[PDB]
Amino acid sequence: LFNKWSYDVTVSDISLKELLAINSKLKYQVFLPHTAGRYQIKPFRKIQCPIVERLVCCMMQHGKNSGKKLLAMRVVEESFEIIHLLTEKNPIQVLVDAIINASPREDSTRRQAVDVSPLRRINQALYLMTMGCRSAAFRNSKTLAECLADEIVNASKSNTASFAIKKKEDMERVAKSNR
């Protein structure tokens, strides 16, 4: 990703294997999370975006940080080194399994319990683990890099201390009564 991490990673469940751009073609192994493509002009064009590229752009919210890619990527680039330190595995692999485990499987509509499309499983997975890092680095001594790093490794395997895992089982438990 930065001449440091390889892309020899797989996906646990096939439900997201065809919808995640990891190493399928030669255009996804990109040297930077900075690609200026047009990924929102046709439906299902965002799948062609690199996985880390999509994750980086989700760290650009709350107004005062709008349209600042360089500031956003620096947080991610110095976080995947922390994830490797705390897991001794591939940081890309840690992100990939974290998405699968934190992905919701059933939501509700105004209530009727309904399942979630595989893309919305990916889209909501990113929206969850970034919110926890954004809120937990607010008015805190700890930096956003470790804040993002600890959430991914916690939400990776099974930990319920992460914000992503709490919300993933929050909707399923609510949908468990909305059958």
Binding site: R74, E78, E81, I82, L85
Partner: peptide
């Protein structure tokens, strides 16, 4: 690991 002007991670 890296020591830039933004973080000191070791």
């Amino acid at each position: 690991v890296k020591v830039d002007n933004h973080i000191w991670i070791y």
